[PDB]
């Protein structure tokens, strides 16, 4: 007897993700998850209503001081989990 059928499609329910590293802004980035610095990898919200990785952003502004989502004047609104 042959085998059944498999293959589960995916959706785009995952949004508002740190484009800098392309990692769940809620969780630690690939740079913090490997170094185990999650506790430090916090979420930084901007005036443009865009959450990012306090660690990434800091490194992003080094090259582009503009939100990689709306390329708008990045303004650290609030920081925290
Ligand atoms: Zn990131
Ligand atoms: Zn990080
Ligand atoms: Zn933005």
UniProtKB/Swiss-Prot annotation:
Enzyme Commission number(s) from the entry: 2.3.2.27, 2.3.2.32
Pathway it works in: Protein modification; protein ubiquitination; Protein modification; protein neddylation
Taxonomic classification: Eukaryota, Metazoa, Chordata, Craniata, Vertebrata
Ligand binding (Zn(2+) 3): 29, 32, 41, 55
Identification of the protein by name: RING-box protein 2
GO BP terms: endoplasmic reticulum unfolded protein response; post-translational protein modification; proteasome-mediated ubiquitin-dependent protein catabolic process; protein K11-linked ubiquitination; protein neddylation; protein ubiquitination; reelin-mediated signaling pathway; regulation of neuron migration
A molecular function GO annotation: NEDD8 transferase activity
Zn finger (RING-type) start-end: 29-71
GO annotation, cellular component aspect: Cul5-RING ubiquitin ligase complex; cytoplasm; cytosol; nucleoplasm; nucleus
